[model samples]
Target: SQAWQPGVAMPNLYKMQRMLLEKCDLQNYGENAVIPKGIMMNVAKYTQLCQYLNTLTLAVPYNMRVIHFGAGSDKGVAPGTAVLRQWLPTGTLLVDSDLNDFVSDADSTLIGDCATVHTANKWDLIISDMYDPRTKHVTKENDSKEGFFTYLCGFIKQKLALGGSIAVKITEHSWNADLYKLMGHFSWWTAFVTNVNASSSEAFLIGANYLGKPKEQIDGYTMHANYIFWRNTNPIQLSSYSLFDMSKFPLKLRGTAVMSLKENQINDMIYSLLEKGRLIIRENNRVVV
Candidate 1:
């Protein structure tokens, strides 16, 4: 078997290490420095939080579906492909709304369920990053938000099949953020409208095929501002067009990232979306945004 390990090449790296070893001191690693050399801090902030996002997938298996909320300059798709190929859950579907073509370049690593081709297609997972800065105050409803949110929500309940999930990008400033409240959840009103945010540039919003249950069933979920629902394994039905409240859930899954409701629940916090599209947590149903 062929394997690539950088540490084995001690001879070639000797000169380079010697140059740095001469300067090795205390402050950085202290007296217990393992490498005993300068350590490169990962100051780089990558929007590609696939490991994190995959965790939000509730550690489910392959063959699941996904729907990217706001598909754009696709950055995180590579990581998503890695998970999909590794898990392929048998019911995967990618959702995107932008007119641009999706990057299905990972043919060698992962072949998947047919790309929904911009249609919601009852996704098992919803990977949304749907915030176009060009259109501020935009709603996927003004016939401007592009893709489908109601259909996307409906998919989470019914079309996700079983053990399916939907990962959406909820920016503190996206026009699409307003849609999350249309269902009369009432609780999220204040945070939504009063400009109350967790100050996170973006969050991974998951609508799983589960009905959040067992208070400590905390695996595929984590803390953001509020808890996000995760651990999907089946599909349900969206009662109507505006049933986005999530209170009428599957009882085994809930928010992996959640918030409280307050007034002014119609804020658009998507400044980052203008800069980075696909990496924005959610996208047009997971069509590589």
Candidate 2:
């Protein structure tokens, strides 16, 4: 059967449910065996980001320079980093940077604070997946007041090359109008929200064709000043704010902010995994013969 598409009738959830059951036998692992929800969500988020990159990369020239900031200290190459290394054309320099040391298979690995890490070259693609494992939630505080996201934004401002692309993972609930305004710097941008039970609150913002910050006026008033103003301005409460108001964006960019088919498939996969996990947990708790 063809892949599921949005705007169509619901796909066959039963088929996905059965397939998940066969692929992951939580019962066989042990009576106490359980699913790793956070890892699963991370995988889903990374997969979606890669899918977005698959298309975004086509626009950039071959032998591009790519960096994955906050690429975790996994035992081996991080999944997303591995995929990018394999997918990008030959001679593409891929760098993985993280706070801790890890076995990275990228061309080079930088061990330092993502906010402070310095590289001599500009990056054609920058991926920001940094998050606090302890909190597992990105609050408004994290996006303001010299927070991680704020620092990362500053890093992007400095390092991302003209027309470069970026994929950022952030909490959907924490999104605000100010962030939307930041998207104005990109020629095109889209937001994808996953439906996984464990990470329903997580979202990815993919921006392509960076316009290299707006030009400064002769009056000595620069775009950076305006950006800082917006960044420091009091954020609106999610309860009353609309995350994406078409009218607020420039006409050219209005239609670019949308969820695409790849996101739909990723969400479906996550939903299936969530259902499979729930069933496995329930089955393991049941009385066996």
Candidate 3:
């Protein structure tokens, strides 16, 4: 076992490749023993969101239950859950299409489409990477359709604990309406768009639902330094807000289209709520900035 170490010889290429092959390989290991990259890079930005969620859920790792959809080989959720499992055997449920990587020992892996798989009634957190290239079902045709993304988001939102949170990894093709519908489930949420390359970027749509609240009760809202853009779907709620961290996006959006219908909706809601005296814009009570 040539384990990888700082001074140890570069790990056995075969063994390293075997590790990757063992996970996402569609076939049973016996039939599919081909080697590949040891561990895939977190290029989709799963680690960033995972670390953020850890801060919110770590106090009770055992109590925090997470169901990660589209858990591939590097499998978006593993980076976070592996850490929690160390503190204690955390309630980490992984759903994926591959059968090669079965954690029979931990009994935490589910092999199949997340949409069809049987999930426990509820989870404290839900992390997803369903929009990535690995999930071929997310086609370009559906990527921009507001209705499609809305339904997708609504489905994911319904899976949370009454006051649960969800973190979704997204690319530029992700829909704007999807963000609105997601935040519509909660009074607050944050969306991050990180510039990855010259023309492409990745985003995170993070939502936090409130306890004992109906969809109507949840107001629409609205980042971080790395985020090229961020916004809250709800303007009434002051906290849990996300908006563009910078004034300009690194790449130009297609066409002269300045804003989406959903964006306008939030602005309207914000002013309406503010006019109704439900929202206060203030640096402080004495110094309302």
Query: Against the true structure, whose lDDT is highest?
Result: 2
Top TM-score prediction, candidate number: 2
The parts of candidate 2 lying over 4 Å away from their true place are: 1-44, 56-58, 73-77, 134-145, 172-180, 194-199, 214-289
Per-residue lDDT of model 1, residues 67-87, tens digit only: 443342344334334333333
What overall lDDT goes with each candidate model?
Answer: 0.29, 0.44, 0.35
Tens-digit lDDT string for candidate 3 (120-235): 34454566655534443533243333432454465555545444556665443444444544455554455543221112234456665422233432222111211222111111
Candidate 2, 38-128: lDDT as tens digits: 3443443354345434434223443356788877645544766765665566566788888887776688887877766765555666777
C-alpha root-mean-square deviation, each candidate = 20.5, 19.7, 18.4
Q: Predicted candidate 3: what Cα RMSD to the true structure? A: 18.4
Listed in order, each prediction's TM-score against the native is 0.37, 0.54, 0.46
Q: What is the lDDT for 56 in model 3?
A: 35
Q: Global lDDT for candidate 2?
A: 0.44
Error of 3 at 229 (Å): 6.7
